Point group: D2
Chain length 254, copies 4
């Protein structure tokens, strides 16, 4: 039960975002929720989306994580508007589609550093900024994929940015541990989302989990958010630097 | 919230047992509990410990997991007394002191296999028998230690038995997954218990955690119980074949 | 270059044994070789496969690794016939078909313990006895498969025995380290051998390597031998407790 | 024996460089060696160090791996000068001490990307350009540290870059496999070099190896070279996407 908790959720794009999965779960559990979004263009659709929750007030902030200034100011404003927070769900990544298809050895320097910037480094800056709002400690969660642990076809530069994110999580957990801030990842199985259109052979991915994963089915955004609730609540009070696979068991098989 | 769930908790010896931390949590959340023990002396402790729980009824069964007969008849009697169950917590291990306190290369054959038998194989047969009382699906959790992933001083034959337990969890997840039975491990940090006395240098392991783990503190049995509640409940649907470290982040550092 | 080195090779049955590929490689490098066998039928293949080798002398010893006395007396006799040795290649496992070709959760106790006894514990007692023949250091290599680290279809009880075996290597590495005895594993890809017949769906494992592994081809026994040369030689002097995958990069993909 | 093979060795600054360890080993095995450097001062040191080697001529090229054109032109020029090569040893990393000597969560964006760029991405672009001199296949080896797998104190932004690098290796292995180009990492234990100076508490890392690693001693640059000879030669055919820890066992213990 998450009454009198406040969590910032970063990365809702539409009804299919894993982060709207997380949001519906935390909302039902009585958390006060704050949202960040990337582009002022899509604020309109995002307000409509959140009418579905039981949040009595919309707290929305434009933060594109390629800007220090936007993360610093955005979190500073959150603090003034809502006070101290209990945690952050990070659900954000990016690479150029044109890097993701064909040959990883052909990746450009710019495209490689972009995916690092948005998909890994953003966590670090967000943690430093969000720590200011968690004087008594709290919980940080980022979303990764099995590609950060193994070479998976077509995932290319994003795999290497996930490898990076996953270690980011570990170095943060160590750094912020003495402050009572826990930092974990959830490693989600494949789910149909906006950003999933940028991954070549997605249907073959989904298909294969159904065929081969221990549970013989794919997972969904609500299953991610239920593990997010665990990771963000006191239920997981002993757990940091961890990566939980919400992937129907697929990480465990070969 | 676990009203109308029933769980079987194997391996309480006293108030310090990790499994009694699990019981206190699940009892607090409303679950019906069933308990198994090997020694007479443990049944007597269990009768005393039950006065601190809300359990209106004392369901206790002697099960020495070295005996198929006892595991088989144990679980049969459970389904006869309480009906279908929702999961099993397995909190059982053993090894001879004289293997543990020698160099590993001197482990006796009968010692090595004794450790396998009680600490790993017991999970396999328990799962087979518990499966019969889980026609709708369910969840099974076993307790491991970090010495099954790495070589730790003084842990010797138990390390190799936990390496076996951890694979046993994964093979079980794969097998039972289509039956909607999830199988997971919790890798607990060092906790002072009766059996912790068989681990040479134990106080030193404790101090290392306080000094070096992200959270700079040790964990306790209620904290294992809280992760156990997540794994035995529907919050962790989609998670199987997983090993969740409740160890203050110590697994993530080196 | 292993001139004036002596190695003991355990587990040749015929021309397709991985251990025979080890032999061909260490023989080509000038090593003096000693072979151990279980069935008198394997001693007859060894006498025939010897003609193929440069070995001027046959050094052949019956050692069933289920018998302490056979391992003890075998290695003592090796010592008396050839003097101190430089290392041991262990290429030995077993499980019953009846356990292997069932659901893993249906595994028998005696079959589970048989598979641990021959496939894991055998290493620990061989290391202990072999150590008396390595008073100034040496190398011990055992053979494992990816099914030790992941739940692989059809591999069942042998997956748990390989998990055990891989921890055995780490614990042995840690114990025997200060004696300058290194202990490592080779994780071989699927190779068609006599024992391969005991893995269900083995043909479909071979073909999956060809299509999905980075090198897009299956390995052979000579490739395992070449990596065993490295591990068993001064080339790998600061390497210990390690698992080397000789599998065309299959371990690294999902 | 690497007679009539040619290897490009990137990252020698002085006698203590790990890459000079590679160089001595391969030069001793009869390989033709080409060397790349960044600072003119490193070139001068290469000219002196060459006197110790068997190399009958100096093949030195300036390649700052931050520069696409310097990588592209350096390798092209290498092909014209010596022809086709057999592989590359990459021994290059960098980060600012002002990001390294402060909390991880305080890392600057530009510092984070700097270390990714020099320490991880350089491998990708080196592979793409070096593939052009390997029509026949070959071997590429990069140098990493355990800090890429675990959160180690003081290593901070370099550990996230080594994590990126180890995933880079796996993805390069999958991408260049069908070209018969193998791609691997060596995980070296701590060695006194010039860059070691950038790691806070380096002396306390050295001594922990001695006290705790299985072999109870630190390793040196020649041991790295010895495993590099194995990865770069036909002995490790079958081996790709892998990370060999040349670290006296340390990775296997907790
Ligand atoms: N779907 C899967 O199968 C899967 C599996 C495992 C992990 N994940 C991970 O889960 C997370 C969410 O992905 P998703 O599938 O839910 O897709 P999604 O709905 O498209 O969400 C991705 C979000 O990232 C935001 N974003 C991208 N760049 C940003 C920037 N510079 N600043 C702020 N926000 C930015 C996007 O904003 P805009 O729409 O405004 O661009 C979008 O809201 C990602 O980390 C992804 O890598 C996904
Ligand atoms: N304490 C730690 O720091 C630590 C850390 C990580 C993991 N673990 C694991 O946590 C689990 C619980 O251990 P613990 O520390 O809580 O110690 P504990 O209180 O001593 O419990 C050990 C239990 O194992 C039972 N047991 C042993 N052999 C049995 C058999 N043949 N049949 C049925 N029960 C048997 C004992 O029952 P009887 O007394 O009646 O014989 C006892 O209840 C174990 O798997 C242990 O390896 C412990
Ligand atoms: N083939 C593969 O795809 C593959 C892949 C990965 C790992 N491996 C591993 O490689 C190793 C060798 O297997 P292989 O494929 O070469 O098969 P193999 O040629 O059939 O050899 C297996 C050997 O095990 C010996 N052995 C079994 N039980 C023994 C006992 N109780 N005492 C003494 N020796 C015993 C057998 O000897 P007898 O015939 O005299 O009884 C036989 O020589 C095994 O550890 C296996 O698990 C194989
Ligand atoms: N020493 C250790 O304990 C240790 C342990 C594990 C891994 N490693 C790794 O081993 C590799 C070599 O380090 P080391 O200890 O041998 O130190 P080193 O002797 O100081 O070598 C580092 C090399 O990196 C080069 N370099 C830095 N930035 C470059 C750039 N932009 N372009 C071209 N070259 C660049 C330097 O060249 P210039 O001087 O000419 O700039 C130098 O030759 C690194 O990847 C390091 O992470 C070291
Ligand atoms: N967010 C996001 C995202 C961006 C790109 Br471009 C590619 C994939 C993205 O999310 C995923 C979707 C699907 C999978 Cl399987 C993994 C992901 O990381
Ligand atoms: N149960 C149990 C158990 C039995 C022996 Br003998 C040795 C250790 C046991 O439990 C643990 C206690 C402490 C630690 Cl750190 C790990 C454990 O596995
Ligand atoms: N030795 C041996 C062995 C015995 C049985 Br029963 C089953 C498999 C055995 O070796 C393998 C054959 C094939 C593979 Cl893929 C892995 C192995 O461990
Ligand atoms: N090359 C390099 C390098 C540069 C910086 Br700045 C920091 C460390 C570097 O090398 C290492 C030295 C020592 C260790 Cl233990 C690890 C390393 O990766
Ligand atoms: N440290 C003592 C006491 C045992 C324990 O720590 O549990 C020993 O080495 O046996
Ligand atoms: N797949 C067949 C053939 C056995 C084998 O592949 O070795 C089976 O289950 O027996
Ligand atoms: N430990 C000192 C010296 C650095 C080193 O060990 O290289 C520091 O933190 O800077």
């Amino acid at each position: 039960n998450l009454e009198n908790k406040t969590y910032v959720i970063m990365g809702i794009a539409n009804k299919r975002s894993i982060a709207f999965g997380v949001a519906k779960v935390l909302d039902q559990l009585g958390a006060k929720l704050v949202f960040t979004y990337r582009k002022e263009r899509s604020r309109k659709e995002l307000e409509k989306l959140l009418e579905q929750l039981n949040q009595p007030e919309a707290h929305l902030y434009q933060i594109d994580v390629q800007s220090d200034e936007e993360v610093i100011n955005g979190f500073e404003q959150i603090g003034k508007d809502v006070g101290n927070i209990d945690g952050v769900y990070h659900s954000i990544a990016f690479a150029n589609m044109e890097d993701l298809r064909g040959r990883f050895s052909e990746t450009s320097r710019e495209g490689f550093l972009l995916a690092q910037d948005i998909s890994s480094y953003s966590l670090t800056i967000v943690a430093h900024e969000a720590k200011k709002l968690m004087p008594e400690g709290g919980s940080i969660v980022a979303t990764t994929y099995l590609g950060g642990e193994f070479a998976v076809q077509n995932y290319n530069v994003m795999g290497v940015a996930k490898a990076s994110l996953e270690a980011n999580v570990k170095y943060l957990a160590l750094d912020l541990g003495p402050d009572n801030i826990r930092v974990n990842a959830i490693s989600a199985g494949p789910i149909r989302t906006l950003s999933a259109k940028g991954v070549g052979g997605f249907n073959t991915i989904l298909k294969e989990i159904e065929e081969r994963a221990p549970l013989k089915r794919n997972v969904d955004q609500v299953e991610v958010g239920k593990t997010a609730a665990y990771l963000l609540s006191d239920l997981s009070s002993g757990v940091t630097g961890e990566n939980i696979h919400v992937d129907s068991g697929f990480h465990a098989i070969k």
